[PDB]
Design a protein around this ligand. Structure first.
Ligand SMILES: O=C(O)[C@H](Cc1ccc(-c2ccccc2)cc1)Oc1ccc(-c2ccccc2)cc1
Lengths: 255, 259
């Protein structure tokens, strides 16, 4: 009851904090008050360089649009690990069948990645490199044939997701819910997964009603965003199927 | 007040009864063939199919004929849903183009929600319950047509496990129509205001009608995700058919819906 749910919410929030470096509270302040370490801004082809020499980019080893895609892959691999480690703090997650843990992570990370990408996006761009940088939405659409429409649909999703004004303590439970789905293809013991998600869902409801007592039916609106999230992932993989018709060995292995 | 949501629950339920002639209650009573109140005739092959006219109201190869008569039912369901929508409070007050956008995008999502009420894992009622067409028979039909109903069965089997009755669905169907995220809406905010009320009424309803079913509300909303994928598979499958058989006509209403 209240105490029990509110303890898990606290637990998940604490865990969410130390698993994820760039929190939403942090990214929003960096974004459109707390002006003290304003980030470098990539708004066009000329500011993309310099940036390279000014940011501590870790993926540079060749077209501009491909090298931005590849940088987005590197970052995705990092977040998989951060998500993986957060997953392991969700009560009951590690006690599940190991194959099921792997399946849940496998089919969940993309959904979680775009959820949290929203936290770093406004309608004019997205933070990059732990917030030391900013890539404008306009510069991204202007990129080559298949690449210019890779991150527009995430921008579109983010504006409608951020309009819910969740905070991290909201997002922590929300992400738990996503991982502990239960309809992921090929699960062996759905019952403990759904059991856990049921718990997480209960904790999310309470969390939203206390943290947003004036946002009516917010729980239901948040859950409704899962349909947009899955269509986004579904559309994302198809543009990946076209990229395998455009372009390392050991590096191609890492992805 | 709870009491206003309950009255909205009753209103929508009563209008569901009036616009949908084959309820889930009727369908369940037919499907559980332990009630000889009128049992269905069962189509499972070419020969049962051909006998299916001497015995059922039944107005080109086998696959065509089956999906020509499924097109009829589909446009007829569009009208029934369309009639149900006008009964949702506030719906007819919205901008006319919004009204048209809501039906455009909600209608198939509702057709497969309600198709589950006609389905068990084994097959689906047809011709207003008089008939029953097995899942295997549908899955066996020619290269493109056979790939059509199987994803509805898969959804229906899971969705049916929620054990919703007609009063639950009436509210759920109303929430789907009044989304607000549909592409191209002019006044999103009055749509969300109604759906906000619809969602409140659904939540209370599930809590009251299914007291032991924890988080059935949330679980039901998650299902909204399965619906939209099915629309997408179906549509892209529909695009294969118009190129395979250029002699075959999709009904104009359903054409207009698909964009
Ligand atoms: O897209 C639509 O509106 C419908 C949705 C649908 C509606 C009803 C059923 C149904 C199927 C069996 C029994 C009862 C109902 C199945 C699907 O799906 C259709 C699929 C194929 C057709 C079609 C029409 C003419 C020629 C070929 C295919 C029409 C509709």
């Amino acid at each position: 009851e209240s105490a029990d749910l509110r303890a898990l919410a606290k637990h998940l929030y604490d865990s969410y904090i130390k698993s994820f470096p760039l929190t939403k509270a942090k990214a929003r302040a960096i974004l459109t008050k707390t002006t003290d370490k304003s980030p470098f801004v990539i708004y066009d082809m000329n500011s993309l360089m310099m940036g390279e020499d000014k940011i501590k980019f870790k993926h540079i080893t060749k077209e501009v649009a491909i090298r931005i895609f590849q940088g987005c892959q590197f970052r995705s691999v990092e977040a998989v690990q951060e998500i993986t480690e957060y997953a392991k703090s969700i009560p009951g997650f590690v006690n599940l069948d190991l194959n099921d843990q792997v399946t849940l992570l496998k089919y969940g990370v993309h959904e979680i990645i775009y959820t949290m990408l929203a936290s770093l996006m406004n309608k004019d761009g997205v933070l990059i490199s732990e917030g030391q940088g900013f890539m404008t939405r306009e510069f991204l659409k202007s990129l080559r044939k298949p690449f210019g429409d890779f991150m527009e649909p995430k921008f579109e999703f983010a504006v409608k997701f951020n309009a819910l004004e969740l905070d991290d303590s909201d997002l922590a439970i929300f992400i738990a819910v996503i991982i502990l789905s239960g309809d992921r293809p090929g699960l062996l013991n759905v019952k403990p997964i759904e059991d856990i998600q049921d718990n997480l869902l209960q904790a999310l409801e309470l969390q939203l009603k206390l943290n947003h007592p004036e946002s009516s039916q917010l729980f239901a609106k948040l859950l409704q965003k899962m349909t947009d999230l899955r269509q986004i992932v579904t559309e994302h993989v198809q543009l990946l199927q076209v990229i395998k018709k455009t372009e390392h060995p050991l590096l191609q292995e890492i992805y």
